[PDB]
Design a protein that fits this description.
This is part of a larger assembly, with two copies of chain A, one copy of chain B and one copy of chain C. Chain A is α/β, with parallel strands linked by helices. Chain A has three domains: 76 residues, Thrombin, subunit H, CATH 2.40.10.170; 275 residues, Rossmann fold (3-Layer(aba) Sandwich), CATH 3.40.50; 118 residues, Orthogonal Bundle (Bovine Mitochondrial F1-ATPase, ATP Synthase Beta Chain, Chain D, domain3). In chain A, the strands form three sheets. A seven-stranded parallel beta sheet of chain A has the order 8-12-11-13-14-10-15, with helices on both faces. In chain A, strands 1-2-5-4-3-6 form a six-stranded antiparallel β-barrel. In chain A, strands 7-9 form a two-stranded antiparallel ribbon. Chain B is built from one helix and no strands. The termini of chain B are far apart. By secondary structure, chain C is α/β, with parallel strands linked by helices. The longest helix of chain C is centred in the middle third of the chain and has 21 residues. Chain C folds into three domains: 73 residues, Elongation Factor Tu (Ef-tu), domain 3 (Beta Barrel), CATH 2.40.30; 286 residues, 3-Layer(aba) Sandwich (Rossmann fold), CATH 3.40.50.300; 128 residues, ATP synthase alpha/beta chain, C-terminal domain (Lysin), CATH 1.20.150.20. Classes of the chains: A alpha/beta, B mainly alpha, C alpha/beta. The interface between B and D is small, with 12 and 10 residues. Chain C: It is found in: Mitochondrion inner membrane. Chain C: It comes from Saccharomyces cerevisiae (strain ATCC 204508 / S288c).
Chain lengths: 470, 53, 501, 469
């Protein structure tokens, strides 16, 4: 091996600067390995500061390091293992089996970095993805190979929403999936590992139709940044080289943003607005652009986003808001209304909803719904002071319908048989359009409002009407 | 007579309501305006502190 | 006697050998020294200043290695030599810390004689993996009815106590410790929780009262009190949660189940803020260094419910965050909220409203865990939540001169009674077996009619009545932990019997 | 040999000396630079190494020629203590600023001292009666306690304290310390005169009070170590004389504020709202050296000048941490004309409990809080609509609370001059009765004007007769 040896010069948190000797200087974005009783500490080369000294970011805890410690260079950006021998095991930031699956890799490794496909590579899509979740199906239909985006705040049962998607869509889909967790709890981790072993997606006998890359919040901020890149490359290997349809899931990208903001300060970059990195736009951009359906395989990414304190004017959610194809907002208010899905319907916009894409009928039904719900919200203030008085009878029926619709959007989740107890309903998209159409016509205005609440399709709604009637 | 008094009284009341609400608008407006300036100042302090470092 | 012990202490001093590494202090003051030398040096090592001060080392620089003092500035002087301890920071950990107040270093500050330590451990230890964990199958009930029913607390789980400062903020936590007396008195180690109350940033007088309170309720005999009083160094304060954590890990490792209260975690953040600003690290949002998030996250994730293979040993955590101005949009509260597995918002207005506990149930969640509460209590409080949610909705509607219809006022009337039912006086934990009846009565609307003033009387008397006749019934609730048909009927009849008289 | 030096820099009142000989300085030493304006006392605060200290200078630094001879007096500034401190007002160094000539001393003690140990702590709660209805009712003080006031901008922050001094400290026999950090000099002279007049200072006799007074004029650095000086005087009484002390501090905002001035110059990157990054430690040291230990029970009273009237500012925030009672007084309640201006929903004490002031007191307090909380809640509705549009049941509560609000204003004896209304000192035993009656609506049947600015319940009755005329 090349004698690219550097002696550490400054351990100042994650930032560790190395002093490679003259004429043997690494290249920016290389990977340094340092033998330690902690295995090999990996330092990712991120700047040259001249005079044969680089400033690199650590991927592991920098406690108990020695100032002047010899550093070998393995060169280039960290090379993970890729294959279909990456299917079904927990792969840590640097790739190690954190589930003791022993050697991981098929025959190949790939670098953590990869370039985003060029404009020429891009190939337009406009498919459809039925989730069975009625609100999603009617008011913001997803599309296969999409870049679905789960904007929501803290603890919107964010994992739970995703869990429903995995339960239905992943098992259903033939494409491989990669569940990547960036800075999520080991509590959540143990549950997810167990749950997806149970749903059999992770089949511990046969091949798993999913891989896991769990990066947790206990890992250093530096390591947290490069959980994302690692997972992304596994997905790229599927997308490109295996050619397969993918159905990526990543969690949570605020942790990616946040991680980058933290080490930005440490890198010496003067903080930008709301303390975020000045490189915020482009760092996000590199991740987002890399994920795309090209001539090669279709990555059906579902990307979680955490909106700090439900403030969407904050630059970190707001920047992400542009970058994702099919935004969905899961709001606290709606959660509080007891509606799980917590999806805020008027605040969920999708480019995939169109009177051509899903056709005029689907569109028209949803357009009437949107207006109806918006009317109810606008009138809520009138009801607050004025009450039912100088408010039209017609308006009152619309209000009543909106309350019915509001709770018709309420339907349980199968993965909330433990977070509720009523089993979820995968209601066919066409059936949902029809069933909602009926409501708008007022064909079921004899049905109690609460007989729309937390049940499935029209057949179920009628059944719960009867149940309540008794 | 009663109904006429009811409608007459509400007209008087709702007029007086409008005045009282207006005062509250003015008070929260000043608070809003000051607070807006203050947010800018607080952000600036963070920026200066960063620049100094 | 005292002479022999002193003779032992002097006798225990004897000889030394060549001290490796030296370096000379130069600039120094604030509490942050920078020494020249110490070429070999582990990061986070403890280095003995010749003044007497011991200091961890947080900056290794190709100039001057920055050793954060754990002692007073006045002791330190220019060009002093510092000789490296040769140990990354470490804590004595053992059984003897039970029944001891200890400072961050681990020396008894209550001076009940030097600790009996079964080991030493390291202050930074990374969180247990995905592999060594079991899902939370063991409740831990605080004995506060609102908490147990509405926000169920399970061993392992990190549950965040957040709200306006010292509005009995400490007292909410202390109640939990007191109800853990009930298991403590009992038997079976895994059905016992040991309890570590960590006090950072609080005045000596508050702490002294607290230890006194714990001795008063005679709940001191299974507690470890880790303290870092207000005067004490910002470095010692920063190190204080992490050294508490290791003491907890000794329990966790033993397979013992225990609970660690980190009160106030907010004061750790202030400490790290100071530490960073005098290490001249670029300051983060609101001048808290950015890796405050990292600091808090690594700390909190060390508590866990381990796998059956890994002995199940559940360290349970309760962080306590002071909310300055009651606005959680501040950087440190926002950060913590993400980290924690539940939030238990307390509101000041409700304290004044006379709801004591003043916990705002609208803002309080336990986002995970539901096998974290007793099956019986889950059944009864099934619609306790719904009724309360409805009460909240109806009450909101009632504002601004809306003339309520009778149906809404059925809800309102029912709702009001529930609110009176929840209230509990400070330092008055209850037995869950006797919290199940009270909720049964309320939820089954037997209290709805009962006059608002005498609800408290009803509660007291009802409990006495249940003690009198249906003490068999209470024993069963303890024994089976899920209400059977027989119990439901017995309970229904009993409750009915007590509605009048 | 003389640790001579030269003044390398005079950057504000943060002079830096460069000691010649390699005899070391030590942090928190004191240095005397002899000036033709008399000596100047500086205190070593940083070592920059290579025999260059950076020193806080207590008194003004005008005139200094860069390269001015120094002599190191060694160790922190030493006050002079004794019984002779009593009846003397002293400069930071300890020189009589009341010019009562040489203060004979036994022990001269270092300004800095270590906080007494956790073991030495002792906690008690002997209910001190202030004779102020609002104080007693809502959050009674107790002996050895640390009492807190969070008065607004010139809300008679001093006036509230003066009433307390007039009542409590003339009902206290033991020693008492008055420490006024950066207070307006003219008010201090009035205070000095009043104390001499009321014999608390009896210059012929002995005084059961001692005083340290720091003018608001005084340079920031002096004000910074005014506290430490006073704190030593208190320790001498607490420890050496053993006698139970009392302590008054006004304003401890000045302690923080001064710190914020020096820190930047000292060389510190400042925390939010400009506050010193050493705020927590400095506050910590000051407030843990004030404590009731086996040695003595020192009841302490701390006054916070809330800056810009924002209590969420970091300096008020860290004060809230170190108190056993607080009685926040706010400008709004002052504007409403209620003197005293104590917020009734922003007062707390650990000394309010049913096992302390009894179940009846606690019950009385519960109702007071509930009524007032309701009253604050309906402030929106009251403004938007009419008060008649309030629900009838609520309208009774509101009327009761309106009365309660007015009732709470009690004329003060030091305010009696200023207001013109003769003061009222109402017994604690009387207070419980008075509010109890109001809660039972007994005397709720007479105007709000009657309840306004009067003493006990009986006084309200008499004032009803007066009002009726």
């Amino acid at each position: 091996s090349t004698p690219i040896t550097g002696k550490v010069t400054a351990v100042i948190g994650a930032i560790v600067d190395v002093h490679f000797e003259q004429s043997e200087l690494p290249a920016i974005l290389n990977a340094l390995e340092i033998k330690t009783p902690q295995g090999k500490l990996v330092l990712e080369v991120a700047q040259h500061l001249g005079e044969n000294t680089v400033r690199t970011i650590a991927m592991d805890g920098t406690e108990g390091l020695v100032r002047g410690e010899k550093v070998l260079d393995t060169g280039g950006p960290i090379s993970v293992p890729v294959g279909r021998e990456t299917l079904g095991r927990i792969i840590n930031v640097i790739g190690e089996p954190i589930d003791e699956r022993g050697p991981i890799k098929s025959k190949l490794r790939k670098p953590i970095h990869a370039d985003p496909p060029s404009f020429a590579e891009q190939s337009t899509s406009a498919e459809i993805l039925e989730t069975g979740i009625k609100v999603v199906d009617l008011l913001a239909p997803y599309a296969r190979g999409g870049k679905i985006g789960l904007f929501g705040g803290a603890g919107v049962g964010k994992t739970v929403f995703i869990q429903e998607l995995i339960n239905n869509i992943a098992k259903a889909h033939g494409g491989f999936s990669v569940f990547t967790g960036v800075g999520e709890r080991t509590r959540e981790g143990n549950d997810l590992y167990r749950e997806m072993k149970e749903t059999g997606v992770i089949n511990l006998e046969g091949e798993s139709k999913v891989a896991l890359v769990f990066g947790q919040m206990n890992e250093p901020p530096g390591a947290r940044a490069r959980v994302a890149l690692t997972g992304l490359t596994i997905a790229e290997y599927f997308r490109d080289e295996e050619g397969q349809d993918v159905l990526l899931f990543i969690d949570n990208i605020f942790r990616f943003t946040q991680a980058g903001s933290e080490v930005s300060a440490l890198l010496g970059r003067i903080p930008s607005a709301v303390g975020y990195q000045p490189t915020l736009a482009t760092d996000m951009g590199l991740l987002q652009e890399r994920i795309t359906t090209t001539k090669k395989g279709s990555v059906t990414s579902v990307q979680a986003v955490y909106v700090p304190a439900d403030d969407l004017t904050d630059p970190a959610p707001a920047t992400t808001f542009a970058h994702l194809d099919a935004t969905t907002v899961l709001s606290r208010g709606i959660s509080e209304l007891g509606i799980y899905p917590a999806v805020d319907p008027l605040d969920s916009k999708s480019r995939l909803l169109d009177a051509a894409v899903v056709g005029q009928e689907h569109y028209d039904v949803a357009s009437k719904v949107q207006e109806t719900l918006q009317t109810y919200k606008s009138l809520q203030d009138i009801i607050a002071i004025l009450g039912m008085d100088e408010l039209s009878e017609q308006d009152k029926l619309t209000v009543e319908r909106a309350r019915k619709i509001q709770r018709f959007l309420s339907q349980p989740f199968a993965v909330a048989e433990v977070f509720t107890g009523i089993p979820g309903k995968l209601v066919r998209l066409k059936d949902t359009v029809a069933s909602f159409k009926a409501v708008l016509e007022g064909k079921y205005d004899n049905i109690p409002e609460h007989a729309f609440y937390m049940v499935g399709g029209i057949e179920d709604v009628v059944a719960k009407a009867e149940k309540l009637a008794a | 007579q009663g109904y006429a008094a009811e409608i007459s009284a509400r007209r008087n009341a709702m007029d007086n309501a409008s005045k009282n609400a207006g005062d509250m608008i003015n008070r929260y407006s000043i608070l809003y305006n000051r607070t807006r300036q203050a947010v800018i100042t607080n952000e600036l302090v963070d920026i200066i502190t960063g620049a100094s470092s | 006697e005292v002479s022999s012990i002193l003779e032992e202490r002097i006798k225990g001093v004897s000889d030394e050998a060549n001290l490796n590494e030296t370096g000379r202090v130069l600039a120094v003051g604030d509490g942050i020294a920078r020494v020249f030398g110490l070429n070999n040096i582990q990061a986070e090592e403890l280095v003995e200043f010749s003044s007497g001060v011991k200091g961890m080392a947080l900056n290794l620089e190709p100039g001057q290695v920055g050793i954060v003092l754990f002692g007073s500035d006045r002791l330190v002087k220019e060009g002093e030599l510092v000789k490296r301890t040769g140990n990354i920071v470490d804590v004595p950990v053992g059984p003897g810390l039970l029944g001891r107040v200890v400072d961050a270093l681990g020396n008894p500050i209550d001076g009940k004689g030097p600790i009996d330590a079964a080991g030493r451990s390291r202050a930074q230890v990374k969180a247990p993996g995905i592999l060594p964990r079991r899902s939370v199958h063991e409740p831990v009930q605080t004995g506060l009815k609102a908490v147990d029913a509405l926000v169920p607390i399970g061993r392992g789980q990190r549950e965040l106590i957040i709200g306006d400062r010292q509005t009995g903020k400490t007292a909410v936590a202390l109640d939990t410790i007191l109800n853990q007396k009930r298991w403590n008195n009992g038997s079976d180690e895994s059905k016992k929780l040991y309890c570590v109350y960590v006090a950072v940033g609080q005045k000596r007088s508050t702490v002294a009262q607290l230890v006194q309170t714990l001795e008063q309720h005679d709940a001191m005999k299974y507690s470890i009190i880790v303290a870092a009083t207000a005067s004490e160094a910002a470095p010692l304060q920063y190190l204080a949660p992490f050294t508490a954590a290791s003491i907890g890990e000794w329990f966790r490792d033993n397979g013992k189940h225990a609970l660690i209260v980190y009160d106030d975690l907010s004061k750790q953040a202030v400490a790290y803020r100071q530490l960073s600003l005098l290490l001249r690290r670029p300051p983060g949002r609101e001048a808290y260094p950015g890796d405050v998030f990292y600091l808090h996250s690594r700390l909190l994730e060390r508590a866990a419910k381990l796998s059956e293979k890994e002995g199940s040993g559940s360290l349970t955590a309760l962080p306590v965050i002071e909310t300055q101005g009651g606005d959680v949009s501040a950087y440190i509260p926002t950060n913590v909220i993400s980290i924690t597995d539940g939030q238990i918002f307390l509101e000041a207005e409700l304290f004044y409203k006379g709801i004591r506990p003043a916990i705002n149930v609208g803002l309080s969640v336990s986002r995970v865990g539901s096998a974290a509460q007793v099956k019986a209590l889950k059944q009864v409080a099934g619609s306790l939540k719904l009724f309360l949610a409805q009460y909240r909705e109806v009450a909101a509607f009632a504002q601004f001169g809306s003339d309520l219809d009778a149906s809404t006022k059925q809800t309102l009337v029912r709702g009001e009674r529930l609110t009176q039912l929840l209230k509990q006086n400070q330092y008055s934990p209850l037995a869950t077996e006797e919290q199940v009846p009270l909720i049964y009565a309320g939820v089954n609307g037997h209290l709805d009619g009962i006059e608002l003033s005498r609800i408290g009387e009803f509660e007291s008397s009802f409990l006495s009545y249940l003690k009198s006749n249906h003490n068999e019934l209470l024993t069963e609730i303890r024994e089976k932990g899920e209400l059977s048909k027989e119990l439901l009927a017995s309970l229904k009849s009993a409750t009915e019997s007590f509605v009048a008289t």
